[PDB]
């Protein structure tokens with residue numbers, strides 16, 4: 102009977118309202134600075150070259166904006182990079198199909214590839230989960246000879262994982278923009294702003310396991326939310342119980 | 354037995370790996386078969402438009418013109434109208450577009466059109482995602498269960514009107530046909546019709562719908578209503594992709610048992 106979705110709905114809406122105000126607070130500042138300096142770089146280009154004119158420069162921008170729809174891409178390996186992005190639902194967004202048959206294929210290629218790749222990621226998950234189980238069975242015998250012990254183990258998970266899958270692969274995949282790269286990619290958000298050939302056979306496997314790593318990390322963070330959702334549910338429960346108490350005694 | 358079923362798993366994992374590898378190799382060759390032609394045709398005609406602009410204006414900096422195009426394309430990484438017409442513009446981080454952006458992050462859609470440039474907006478986005486993705490996950494799950502029982506109500510009436518003198522196992526297929534039927538109407542067809550006029554051709558809307566809901570990437574009822582279309586459409590493909598995955602387990606068995614017999618016999 103109890104819906105309980107509406108409350109989670111408003112939390113998400115409110116999370117998004119807070120997120121919005123925080124993003125425009127952080128980004129609309131540089132947006133002005135950058136775009137005041139873009140108006141400068143036209144008027145510096147127009148003044149420094151009387152050869153090109155006002156009416157003719159927009160004809161260049163249009164044909165650049167037309168070239169945005171296109172840009173060797175689609176080579177033997179770049180289309181397989183593209184194909185990986187589709188089934189992983191990463192989809193960096195840099196290259197997309199333009200032919201009507203490439204879209205109809207991409208629709209079928211996704212509807213079949215996403216579940217298929219899901220089974221691969223699931224197997225790599227269980228594969229990697231027992232490998233981690235091997236590493237903690239030894240560690241949970243050396244200094245254990247137990248309810249709070251389970252926290253020390255989860256500290257070493259986030260520690261050893263954010264080394265292999267966040268810190269280290271900065272080389273494989275500045276200091277911040279690497280962690281930013283890693284998180285946006287492995288959360289499958291789609292890392293658009295940035296993106297030897299024998300490189301991608303090993304890199305795409307660090308992706309395959311890093312995807313399994315954040316898949317677990319995201320699920321733990323979700324499990325911490327079920328916990329904190331109950332603590333906040335019971336806390337409000339008490340403070341309503343005593344305020345009702347209080348309102349009753351004060352009236353007498 | 355405890356590390357013997359793991360031997361049985363790794364075999365199944367490595368085979369799924371190769372299936373994925375082939376699936377990507379096949380997909381690659383099919384995309385480059387379809388898209389390499391469009392590229393070269395447009396790529397040759399974009400070199401023409403350079404060498405027509407260079408001859409038409411000898412007194413522009415021939416060598417430094419690409420240095421202009423780069424700095425324009427570098428500015429394209431931000432939302433820009435760098436034109437002498439309307440040197441004044443709008444913000445892509447306004448009150449509602451950042452709330453568009455935020456949703457794309459928690460849904461992991463993240464169209465990639467606008468990304469944060471401030472290192473404080475990146476550090477926030479990392480934390481905002483690591484917390485928002487699980488949070489939104491519970492909403493999508495609740496919307497799923499919410500929508501699933503609504504479907505259960507609609508199929509309990511339909512699986513009693515057609516009860517003639519019946520087989521329980523075969524009726525379950527008629528129900529999954531009417532699911533994909535209503536679903537691709539409300540969540541694929543009707544929006545593709547609406548997203549055809551407002552914004553596109555007939556195909557490019559369904560392409561838009563699929564790419565979005567697979568999470569790849571004055572009475573104005575748009576973002577409170579469209580993104581609630583998204584919220585439920587995401588729950589819809591989440592089920593659809595899961596059935597397609599369930600269809601694959603079935604087909605994975607049947608092909609694995611069929612190869613089993615044809616290995617065993619080899620035509621007597």
Ligand SMILES: CCCCCCCC(=O)OC[C@H](COP(=O)(O)O[C@@H]1[C@H](O)[C@H](O)[C@@H](OP(=O)(O)O)[C@H](OP(=O)(O)O)[C@H]1O)OC(=O)CCCCCCC
Pocket residue numbers: 105108109112327329330331333334337484
């Ligand atoms: C980023 C941090 C966000 C923290 C979010 C934390 C706030 C938040 O998320 O709300 C949760 C709560 C209602 O949600 P609620 O806890 O009842 O959700 C239930 C809960 O998850 C239980 O596990 C299950 O039921 P039960 O209980 O075992 O029977 C069931 O889950 P499942 O069956 O589907 O598996 C759900 O019915 O609402 C308030 O806290 C009241 C004050 C509003 C506070 C809002 C403003 C603080």
Ligand SMILES: CCCCCCCCCCCCCCCC
Pocket residue numbers: 277280476479480
């Ligand atoms: C014992 C409590 C520790 C909990 C771990 C909190 C990690 C928060 C991650 C925030 C990411 C900041 C990235 C900054 C990189 C320059």
Ligand SMILES: CCCCCCCCCCCC
Pocket residue numbers: 372375376379608609612
């Ligand atoms: C895109 C579909 C490719 C089909 C690949 C089938 C592989 C069959 C392997 C059978 C092993 C049991």
Ligand SMILES: CCCCCCCC
Pocket residue numbers: 205208209212
């Ligand atoms: C243009 C129609 C696409 C239908 C794809 C169906 C794949 C199961």
Ligand SMILES: CCCCCCCC
Pocket residue numbers: 123472473474476477
């Ligand atoms: C460098 C400033 C980032 C701090 C983000 C604060 C979000 C609550």
Ligand SMILES: CCCCCCCC
Pocket residue numbers: 213372604605608
């Ligand atoms: C296109 C159908 C996929 C077949 C894969 C079978 C799994 C072994």
Ligand SMILES: CCCCC
Pocket residue numbers: 112115116119
């Ligand atoms: C942004 C989460 C604080 C409680 C709603």
Ligand SMILES: CCCCC
Pocket residue numbers: none
């Ligand atoms: C990072 C604060 C979110 C509320 C738990």
Ligand SMILES: [K+]
Pocket residue numbers: 189190191288289290460461462567568569
């Ligand atoms: K995604």
Ligand SMILES: [K+]
Pocket residue numbers: 190191192289290291461462463568569570
């Ligand atoms: K994505």
